[PDB]
Design a protein around this nucleic acid. Sequence first.
RNA 1: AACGAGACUCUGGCAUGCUAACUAGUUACGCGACCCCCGAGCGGUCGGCGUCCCCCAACUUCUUAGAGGGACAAGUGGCGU
Lengths: 313, 126
Amino acid sequence: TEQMTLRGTLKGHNGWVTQIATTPQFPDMILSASRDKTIIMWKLTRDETNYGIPQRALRGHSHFVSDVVISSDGQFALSGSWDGTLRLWDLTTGTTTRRFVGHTKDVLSVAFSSDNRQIVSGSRDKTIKLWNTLGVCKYTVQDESHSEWVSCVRFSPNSSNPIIVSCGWDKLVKVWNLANCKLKTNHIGHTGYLNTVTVSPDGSLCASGGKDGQAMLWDLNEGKHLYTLDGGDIINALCFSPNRYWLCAATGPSIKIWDLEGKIIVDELKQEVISTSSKAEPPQCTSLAWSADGQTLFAGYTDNLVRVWQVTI
Amino acid sequence: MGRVRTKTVKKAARVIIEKYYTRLGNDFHTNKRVCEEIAIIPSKKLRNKIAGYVTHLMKRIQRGPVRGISIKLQEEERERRDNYVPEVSALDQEIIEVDPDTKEMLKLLDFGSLSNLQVTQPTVGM
RNA sequence: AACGAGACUCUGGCAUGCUAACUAGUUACGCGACCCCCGAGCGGUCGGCGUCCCCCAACUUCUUAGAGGGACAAGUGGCGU
Ligand SMILES: [Mg+2]
Ligand SMILES: [Mg+2]
């Protein structure tokens, strides 16, 4: 039986942990964006007395850091914060190489191309923006876009003809041809705003969740709606699997991991159960990331902690 | 000290909740932006105070309903209880039964079945 | 329902984030020069002092002043019909 176990916990932050990103190149370094305006790059010392130390704090941002992603080579990082600016870092020293100015409101999401050639950003301006990798504005989706906050944008991993997909606060999942930057199709449903969106590594499904609490699976090839999983409380971040057919979902205080084959829950990752003497008892779950080894997942919470969960047999 | 909010803040927060109930959450830094985008507050301090009272109201609406804001989700749970429910049934057992001087009364309007009796101690408090 | 209180305006505290500056500067070395060995050394090369002189050097940390941000009893524990 495949089970999950709490290996260790990482400390060093001061506010909420908002994003976690791992690269398949270096299996011993993690990026963690937090609400204390810093981005911590970790020294993942695999011991068990602790589990990791912050290696370097990428500083320089005037508000919350909402999104971060590592490049394909492991030498750069892209970040998007709540002052409208995007930053291209250097994982060797710091020294933000290029800031991507141009927005009127906070920057929510950020995503990197398959070859790290274009950049995409969604903000609260109801504007999706494409950028050259030199710090200039390539294209802007001004209208036919969402009517509310564009909460998340992602690239498809396919070399076969290219998709980008965006979810918003207008309870819609919109999909775009990347060459043309026009709409391909709509996706209706999801009563309530949308928190996240993701594409499977095979580039064939989009698992979208939000306030509703139900994770919906959409097909990127058929242009239909496959099926729905009621995730229970609420969905913060949905992430697919690197070497399995699961789907990890971040509910309020828990993490729900489905076997998609017969669409059945495998586990409910609940932390410790102190009798919290009033009010909302547990620190809620913000983000989660699967390691390229497919063996351990990292989860960033709202109480300044980053917890590890290892697959055990 | 102070920290007592004014009617201009409380009424604004109550209206903001009663219209945009589904956009508001439990954290302050998001309710701030929501109220910033849905309303027109002509100051930043007032915006923060309104968004801070909205959070304190939301933390309560998750419990029992407050008595100044009416939403749709919390009205159905009243409506669907004000219509009949299987907790209630009919008159609980339809073999209800009486005492004398009621049978003596019922006899004066022609009733004749399905009753009982009892006689008490002869006056109060004995 | 109205006035007064509050809200409001100026001000003090914070930004290694933005905007940009020989009527403000920093650092760098181009420097060049003075001086002392005060260090290894020779005294030179390396350094140490400079409101001494230059840069069509790179920058805005200190100075200036604009735009935004940021604090809300928001978080946690008690006391509260
Ligand atoms: Mg009155
Ligand atoms: Mg309290």
